[PDB]
Amino acid sequence: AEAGITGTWYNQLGSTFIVTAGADGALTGTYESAVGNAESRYVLTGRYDSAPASGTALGWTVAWKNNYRNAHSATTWSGQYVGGAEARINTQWLLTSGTTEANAWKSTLVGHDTFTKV
Amino acid sequence: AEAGITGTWYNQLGSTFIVTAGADGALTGTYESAVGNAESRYVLTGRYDSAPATDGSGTALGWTVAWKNNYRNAHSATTWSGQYVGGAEARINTQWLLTSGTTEANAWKSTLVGHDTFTKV
Amino acid sequence: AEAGITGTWYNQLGSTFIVTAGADGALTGTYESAVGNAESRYVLTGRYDSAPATDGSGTALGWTVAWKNNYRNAHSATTWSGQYVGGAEARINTQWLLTSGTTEANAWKSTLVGHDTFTKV
Amino acid sequence: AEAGITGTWYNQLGSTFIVTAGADGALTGTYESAVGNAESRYVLTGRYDSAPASGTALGWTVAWKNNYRNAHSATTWSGQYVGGAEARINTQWLLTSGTTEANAWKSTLVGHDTFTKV
Ligand SMILES: Cc1cc(/N=N/c2ccccc2C(=O)O)cc(C)c1O
Numbered sequence: 214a215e216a217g218i219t220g221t222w223y224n225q226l227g228s229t230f231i232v233t234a235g236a237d238g239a240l241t242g243t244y245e246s247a248v249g250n251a252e253s254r255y256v257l258t259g260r261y262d263s264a265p266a267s268g269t270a271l272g273w274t275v276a277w278k279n280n281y282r283n284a285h286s287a288t289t290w291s292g293q294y295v296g297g298a299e300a301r302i303n304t305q306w307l308l309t310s311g312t313t314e315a316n317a318w319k320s321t322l323v324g325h326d327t328f329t330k331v
Numbered sequence: 332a333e334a335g336i337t338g339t340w341y342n343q344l345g346s347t348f349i350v351t352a353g354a355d356g357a358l359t360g361t362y363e364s365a366v367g368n369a370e371s372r373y374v375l376t377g378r379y380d381s382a383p384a385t386d387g388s389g390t391a392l393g394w395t396v397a398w399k400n401n402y403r404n405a406h407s408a409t410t411w412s413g414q415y416v417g418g419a420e421a422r423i424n425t426q427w428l429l430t431s432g433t434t435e436a437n438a439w440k441s442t443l444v445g446h447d448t449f450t451k452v
Numbered sequence: 453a454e455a456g457i458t459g460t461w462y463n464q465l466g467s468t469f470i471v472t473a474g475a476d477g478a479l480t481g482t483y484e485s486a487v488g489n490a491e492s493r494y495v496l497t498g499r500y501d502s503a504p505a506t507d508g509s510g511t512a513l514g515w516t517v518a519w520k521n522n523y524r525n526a527h528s529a530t531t532w533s534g535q536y537v538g539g540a541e542a543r544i545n546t547q548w549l550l551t552s553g554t555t556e557a558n559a560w561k562s563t564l565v566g567h568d569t570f571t572k573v
Numbered sequence: 574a575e576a577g578i579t580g581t582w583y584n585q586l587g588s589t590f591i592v593t594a595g596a597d598g599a600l601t602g603t604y605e606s607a608v609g610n611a612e613s614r615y616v617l618t619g620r621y622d623s624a625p626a627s628g629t630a631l632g633w634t635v636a637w638k639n640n641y642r643n644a645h646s647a648t649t650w651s652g653q654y655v656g657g658a659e660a661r662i663n664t665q666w667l668l669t670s671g672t673t674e675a676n677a678w679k680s681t682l683v684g685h686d687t688f689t690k691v
Pocket residue numbers: 224226228245246247248249250251252277283284285286288306308324326560
């Protein structure tokens with residue numbers, strides 16, 4: 214479980230997610246993105262169901278600001294962890310950019326990522 | 332921001348979001364839901380842009396809540412993604428995704444999508 | 453429905469949606485956008501539940517617009533999915549997805565998501 | 574192009590989509606779903622960019638009512654057609670169910686389907 218989630222994971226774009234699942238339902242770690250106006254690692258934080266039944270529900274957020282670059286945007290991934298000998302985290306994500314009120318209608322992208330555990 | 336964002340907010344359904352914005356970009360607090368398989372408060376954690384642009388744009392942010400506390404566990408989690416817009420009548424406009432843990436056969440229908448507007452009233 | 457749904461509607465941005473609801477479930481009409489790379493009217497086509505439940509529920513519906521007319525082509529399309537709720541002050545509440553045609557390298561960022569509320573005013 | 578889109582396609586769940594792309598940007602056809610409260614074929618209608626640049630943008634809708642069953646819901650797929658010797662239509666979809674006003678918050682599911690051409 215906790216053992217299940219904690220580790221290094223990669224998505225289909227070549228991005229890397231390193232996470233630790235705490236006994237209280239916390240997720241903490243770092244994210245390194247292959248795409249966008251990003252470079253180096255960014256802090257992530259999230260939550261997971263620490264007493265799952267079925268996959269395990271979880272979610273996390275990254276604000277794309279570090280000591281090197283600021284894209285003025287944040288992404289949230291919502292999904293579930295599924296274990297076995299082909300462990301995966303399947304998600305859908307929302308990326309919101311800070312915009313003026315007149316451009317807010319086009320502030321949010323949606324997509325999906327699948328993570329494989331190393 | 333932190334300043335602006337820190338406080339007690341309410342959405343249109345009447346749920347309450349109590350948050351603290353750290354100088355560094357962390358969001359921490361509690362969420363109390365008006366709907367769904369929930370009772371009492373739940374922990375939330377998130378991140379926000381601690382150095383927004385100076386051209387008039389909103390501040391990007393996001394947070395998550397897993398729906399498990401000492402009273403009940405819905406085996407699900409919601410993530411909110413959006414922007415804080417300050418001023419006389421500040422608001423946080425968001426879109427959200429709620430994923431439930433399902434078997435493989437029901438994975439196609441695991442996630443709901445919606446939108447919430449939070450104010451200080 | 454058809455009756456209820458047929459008419460001229462406006463969203464919060466001021467775009468205009470002129471629709472006809474057929475007895476059989478078809479939606480046909482024109483859309484004029486207040487924002488984006490668009491000018492004039494565009495054709496839309498959709499479907500709706502022509503025999504909704506009688507328990508007080510809304511009527512499910514959806515429609516699409518490709519953004520190409522005789523004046524301009526944005527190489528994109530939006531789909532709206534939602535429900536019509538009748539009454540004294542009828543509304544259509546929707547969520548939408550706008551996909552642009554992109555190269556393979558930019559496919560990850562091809563689709564925007566949002567929400568629109570349409571009224572008769 | 575038009576030739577490109579018109580045909581029979583299947584998704585990862587085993588559902589079938591039969592569509593004809595008209596010269597005016599119309600899409601018409603039928604959909605047979607492998608999942609949900611559905612049976613037999615349903616009418617679909619949509620639109621596509623008839624003069625694409627990059628993939629070709631398109632979208633379509635199905636209301637899940639036919640002469641045999643009514644689920645009181647509709648799905649819209651938004652995506653793009655990409656040709657080659659491995660032709661595909663990649664989409665994201667929204668499924669909305671008719672609900673009472675008190676349950677409207679949970680009326681809409683979101684997902685993604687990839688279609689392969691037969
Ligand atoms: C605006 C902005 C967007 C961005 N997209 N990230 C992602 C978004 C969706 C799916 C995967 C990733 C991924 O990184 O795997 C990354 C940075 C750094 C940024 O500033």
